[PDB]
Structure 1
Amino acid sequence: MAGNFDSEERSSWYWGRLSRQEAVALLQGQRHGVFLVRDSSTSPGDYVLSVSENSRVSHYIINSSGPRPPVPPSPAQPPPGVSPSRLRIGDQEFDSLPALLEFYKIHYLDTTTLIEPVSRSRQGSGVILRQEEAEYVRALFDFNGNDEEDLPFKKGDILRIRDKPEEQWWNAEDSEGKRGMIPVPYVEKYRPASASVSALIGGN
């Protein structure tokens, strides 16, 4: 998780509209009590709630007004300024659409109740991609090589820690281009730059 960003949360229930078949296609793929929302394929300016009921997934047309701007951008677009309830679905009334999914969770739409957002996949993770620096170390030992995983480098070779599994061996690219283990407990932080014409190069 990341926190509070979208009062309606797009990656949760409202992705970016499509055809009931599409929503359905994914909906059924999730938990039986899963339901997502789509765009009013019938109405020009309205929302639609989709719900995997029984074997398929039915839709519920929502009616939105829009009293205030939706997104920060947009040069100028004067809003209505009258629609009180603004958003509503079925034969009842609610403040907004996002809020609707939070109340009907136990009110029962037309036969089925709302439980959680479909969420087919994707999530704010980013797999914490560091990639901090890279080329800034000069090996201090020569070795022909025995294992494909071990980085065979020659004394004075400026490698780049391609990763750092543990403090007892890291990953780095050698003058040849291959990677492997490197001296994490003792390496030469040697600023490489002056030739770039390959002096010798002889690994495999």
Structure 2
Amino acid sequence: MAGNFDSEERSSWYWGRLSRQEAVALLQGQRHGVFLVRDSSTSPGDYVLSVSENSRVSHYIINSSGPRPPVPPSPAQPPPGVSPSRLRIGDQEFDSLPALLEFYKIHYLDTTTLIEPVSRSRQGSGVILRQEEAEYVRALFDFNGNDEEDLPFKKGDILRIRDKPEEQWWNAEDSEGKRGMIPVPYVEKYRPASASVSALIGGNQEGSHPQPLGGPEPGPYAQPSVNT
């Protein structure tokens, strides 16, 4: 952090093979301007460029045909020395990704302009709202915390789980009064004398219309250039 933000680092600006839901789950809502890149599960060979526009981000499918003529591997390229590559985002193509990342940093590719890399940024809960809650959990690790919002606590601490955003963290509060997202696989369920009722997490049972994972989208990630 601090000094790990760039377009030619392929470490902070490139998430690699991030899920279409996890690549936007973190980017979407980072700050005033942010962007990232995925590999598209369906298009493992084609990378994508996301750019936090509105509620969600802006998934854009890029194409890397690789510097190779039509039919051959590369018979005529080394000699001239100047051998370009094959990389196209929406409609405009150049060499690589970072080459087109700076091309729309202030040119508006589809409606959001290109900004700085999201990277880990920090934490950011992202839990849900409007739902019952209850206390019951006894931490099991000496954590420190990511920020002043997250929930650290040490081993042997009971938090008030506000909700189950995931299996890795369960929104909870510490016995001090502060709250945040705790480490699920680090704490557990514990009922000292307040079992309470309800659950919420057991609201559904994965019927036929919901299904696990999430609605598949075996298709392209659109293109920043459609009619502009």
**TM-score, normalised with respect to structure 1:** 0.47
Work out whether residues 35 and 115 of structure 1, in 8 Å CA contact, stay in contact via their aligned partners in 2: yes
Superposition RMSD on alpha carbons, in Å? Answer: 15.2
Work out whether residues 68 and 74 of structure 2, in 8 Å CA contact, stay in contact via their aligned partners in 1: no
Distance 1:202 1:54 in 2: 31
Residue correspondence of structure 1 range 44-193 to structure 2 within 5 A:
44-67=44-67, 84-121=84-121
**Which range is displaced more, 178-187 or 66-75?**
178-187
**Which range is displaced more, 66-75 or 128-137?**
128-137
| C-alpha displacement of 1:19 | 1.2
- Decide whether aligned partners of structure 1 residues 71 and 109 sit closer, same or farther in structure 2, where only a CA change above 3 A counts: same
- Decide whether aligned partners of structure 1 residues 9 and 78 sit closer, same or farther in structure 2, where only a CA change above 3 A counts: same
- Decide whether aligned partners of structure 1 residues 132 and 97 sit closer, same or farther in structure 2, where only a CA change above 3 A counts: same
Runs of 4+ in 1 over 6 A off after TM superposition: 1-7, 68-83, 122-204
- Decide whether aligned partners of structure 1 residues 149 and 99 sit closer, same or farther in structure 2, where only a CA change above 3 A counts: closer
Work out whether residues 68 and 79 of structure 1, in 8 Å CA contact, stay in contact via their aligned partners in 2: no
Work out whether residues 19 and 41 of structure 2, in 8 Å CA contact, stay in contact via their aligned partners in 1: yes
Greater Rg by CA? 1
**Deviations, residues 174-200 of structure 1 (Å, cap 9, x unaligned):** 999999999999999999999999999
Number of residue-to-residue matches in the alignment: 204
Q: Does 1:9 align with 2:6?
A: no
**Which range is displaced more, 135-144 or 119-128?**
135-144
Gaps of 5+ in 1: none
| C-alpha displacement of 1:152 | 32
**Which range is displaced more, 174-183 or 69-78?**
174-183
- Decide whether aligned partners of structure 1 residues 70 and 163 sit closer, same or farther in structure 2, where only a CA change above 3 A counts: farther
**Which range is displaced more, 15-24 or 46-55?**
15-24
- Decide whether aligned partners of structure 1 residues 92 and 197 sit closer, same or farther in structure 2, where only a CA change above 3 A counts: closer
Work out whether residues 6 and 13 of structure 2, in 8 Å CA contact, stay in contact via their aligned partners in 1: no
Distance 2:70 2:6 in 1: 11
Work out whether residues 151 and 181 of structure 1, in 8 Å CA contact, stay in contact via their aligned partners in 2: yes
Work out whether residues 170 and 184 of structure 2, in 8 Å CA contact, stay in contact via their aligned partners in 1: yes
| C-alpha displacement of 1:13 | 1.3
Gaps of 5+ in 2: 205-228
**Deviations, residues 35-76 of structure 1 (Å, cap 9, x unaligned):** 111013332311100111111112101111334999999999
Work out whether residues 35 and 116 of structure 1, in 8 Å CA contact, stay in contact via their aligned partners in 2: yes
| C-alpha displacement of 1:101 | 0.9
Distance 1:177 1:30 in 2: 26
Distance 2:203 2:73 in 1: 55
Work out whether residues 69 and 79 of structure 1, in 8 Å CA contact, stay in contact via their aligned partners in 2: no
Higher strand proportion: 1
- Matched residue SS, 2:160: strand
